[PDB]
Amino acid sequence: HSPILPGAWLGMVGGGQLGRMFCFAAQAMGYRVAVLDPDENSPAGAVADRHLRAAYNDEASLTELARLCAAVSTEFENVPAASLDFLARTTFVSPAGRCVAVAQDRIAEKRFIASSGVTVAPHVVIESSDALAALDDAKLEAVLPGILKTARMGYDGKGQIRVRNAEEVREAHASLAGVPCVLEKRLPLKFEVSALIARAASGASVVYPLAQNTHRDGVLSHTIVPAPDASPTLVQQAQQAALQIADKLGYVGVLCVEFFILEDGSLVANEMAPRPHNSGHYTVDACATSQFEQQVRAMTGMPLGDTRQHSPAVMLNILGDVWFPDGPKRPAVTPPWQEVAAMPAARLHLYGKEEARCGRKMGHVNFTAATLEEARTAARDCARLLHIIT
Template sequence: MSTGPLAPGSVIGILGGGQLGRMLAMAGAKLGFDIHIFDADPDCPAARVAARSWAAPWSDDGAVEAFAARCDAITYEFENIPVHTVSVAAAASCLRPGARSLELTQDRITEKRFINSVGVATVPFAPVDGLADLPAAIALTGLPALLKTRRFGYDGKGQAWIRTPDDAAGAWETIGEQPAILEGAAGFVRELSVVAARSIDGSVKAWPLAENIHQDGILRQSTAPAPGVDAALQARALEIATALGDGMDHVGVFAVELFDLGGGRLLVNEIAPRVHNTGHWTMDACGCDQFEQHIRAVAGWPLGDPTPHSAAVMTNLIGHDVDDWKALASDPQVRLHLYGKRKARKGRKMGHVNRLAPLRG
């Protein structure tokens, strides 16, 4: 395994073949790397833009080993890959970011405890392993509170609000009676995120904060740089990202979802140890976007400059929003990005658009 910067022509492997893997593959190709994709689906979006794709179950250790042995470095595009799988891959190649980033973020209780351990604040929370645990958890968090599965939840799935004690049994049933976390309500004025990158030497660079709007638990729109953010708030976000990145010993891009309580106060909602939907605006508004930055970090290259040259509003194309592709492609103000998914369905992210504007002075 090479410890120095990877030369163009090296092979970078990506575990996962969804839209994030697709955009990473395109960024890697731009820098001269051969990108190999490993996914259970041979027709996944990333496979169709990569130099080579490997299709096998995540549990097929032999296939994972063969894939990893062909790669000079390996990364992953989503956090729900089994830790065992990445451990098998890491034994055969250089894994960036490491398995620790997954171990700390796959379980919401582990994640919250880690965040607090590095001196960063979250909402109050409590583990819930059964219906009988909810009264004590509610006493700790107060109401309203959000009950979430500890693992595998995304885009609003596996969540239920508890607004009165009488809601507890129904919420527990709604999430499938799985091990859970109860989180107190944040009382935020808006949702923000900071997308940052950490290099192998520990340096951290971040893009400006984005302001995010969710609908039905799915990100709908990000505006960046977020309006009304002063230098102190941006510095605090970078401080939080640096503490978390250092604590994970992370190499690559990661995102921190934040609750803005007003008055310069931020709470961390969760960490995504990968490129992130709220960083898609960087593809058209920055000289170095999040996908190129991640490839740079994985390859051991110097990090690029995250300074934006434009402001942007990123809007996700969800489900049949994508049917308007012709009109969007005809709009000179729109930068259209489609993910190559074969079928649109409700709640599925099919693409996104970026609308640029001059930066405010």
Template sequence: MAAPVVAVVGGGQLARMMAPAATALGLHLRVLVEDAVSSAAQVVVDAPVGEPGDPVALERLVSGAAVLTFEHEHVPNTLLTELGDRGIPVHPGPDALVHAQDKIVMRTRLTALGVPCPRWAAVESADGLRQFLDQATGERAAVVKTARGGYDGKGVRVVRDPAEVHDWFSAAATGTGAPLLAEELVPFTRELAVLVARRPSGEVRTWPVVESVQRDGVCAEVIAPAPHLDPATAAQAEQIGRTVAEGLGVTGVLAVEMFELPDGTLLVNELAMRPHNSGHWTIDGAVTSQFEQHLRAVLDLPLGETAAREPWSVMINVLGSQHAVLTDALPLLGPGVKVHLYGKAVRPGRKLGHVTVTGDDLESVRARARAAAATVMGVDA
């Protein structure tokens, strides 16, 4: 009997990290990669080259596949709808995926579901943004985001005057750029994330809520579980994740990123409908990794246990520097350090891999993880 084929759009590190899980589950992974040397193409045998918006490439990708899924959201919904109408399982489906593709659509739907969000407005002009700024509490500032296409801090600006996004308004007006979303500048104490998996038949599981530390708009480290998190707040975060997954009809892994305010209030920041950076710790720190769980979910298989294997897991991203040494540094790392490199060319600030350390003492685990990442990056700890 032939192994079920899971077709994946996107050849980055997320697809690459699905490969070991697919092998363990006896699945055939087929990945549409951007080029023959992309991260996933280096480890996946069946890796056709093509663009995610090319209908011919997508048609070839899904031929004989049991399901189509994604490692990024940048796929035209019209093509996905056409595939779904022909009976090809697409998970998450286009009606759900649009909420990760368009931030205005996301905010509108989350507000309708009663999910707590920052104060927001779609702004079409400088006057509209000026009115939003005039209503700000505290500092007269707002976070302006392009509704589509932004990630890792791109497409996001903190502004105090509409002139600071004049170029974005001009691009939106001419159709060369995306519409704009304005959100209040939230005085949060830290960022949390909850990872949820949901299968088409309705089963839902969540992993422990984590703390996500961002630097320059890029995730730098993740601590699982989030330290000193009130159990009631953790339960609320998990419930928000379940509400979003069920309310949007998400299938597969969903990441819900949140702000925690000084009074313990939670506000949803961003969504990702795929394995996510905040869940990389699960490869080494949880009974079931987010990558195995995503494959289980999109195939409607029973979901795996999500409990942590150790009291603490700390994941540190390996970001490119001018002096990155990468694999040359591996002999210098301790036996308890788990290293995952993505096969990417070195470029300053680029996510080249991550390290994870687990254990029963948070300070020791965090110090070892930071030192290991610094060693791999070729910088001082």
């Protein structure tokens, strides 16, 4: 792969905030970015050098994108893998459709991660309604109480149903329209972390520090880096697990692997995203090379960047709920951005979305400081200010 050098066109399938941040990283290095996204008001399409407003399966637009761009990547884990393979007919596509197909499918994902030598949650695969009917109650009960999760198309905790007994499993599967699912045992979690790596076509790789992640209602709330409760041994183990997965997958791009640390201290892989990840947004303000710049470098065959963290960091997600301090049934209130910007540690990132809605990711604030405790205090003060915490 002769390197694709600055000045070239790079393609981005998906136009959310991840694609928008990719644009800034690519444009700062002198690349031009074409974003393919069906939405008029796409956050990435808004800043891209070119916006192809098209469905992800539109043949003419994929052909146009691959003709224009020397390399293409994605910011959308649920993108059709067949679209990436169609693009790969005429341009370089990083990560490959086959890699995305594994990562986007919980059944394939658990099988692949386990096959890499990495522990996953105890679970039962439910391939179909007919297959579930053939499973006896005891087989389900071994992983109960648990969570029934659709194998495809889930995000932000959607497509997941809590289940406490076999009858609830069968009713839940009908409630999910019978799609392939994984039934996972609910595990006693002590904390959650994510490993963030980038891998080049050559097999060279880089690793970020471990991120410690807190979720609210299944949605990422904040990230603390370096993970304060992860020993150097656990950090190395989680990084090595992510690199082993990426190596076996032949992955080229940025990969994020989420893990649980259980109350007994064991490390359990949860899932992986074939793309930059919300838990990696801190790298923009805290590390020499951001995850978005690694995505540029991997897809162009350029050398991977240094991951040095120059500053401890906390990322706080900003959901649309912040706009409804008097509840969702009452008028929106513009958040107090002037008071956020008055905090020395605060790095405000707003995605340009017009309509605040509850559950919608509207931006994030990174807090960097000389010490982690100062960044954490600042993130806590801002969370109270925004009514994220009491």
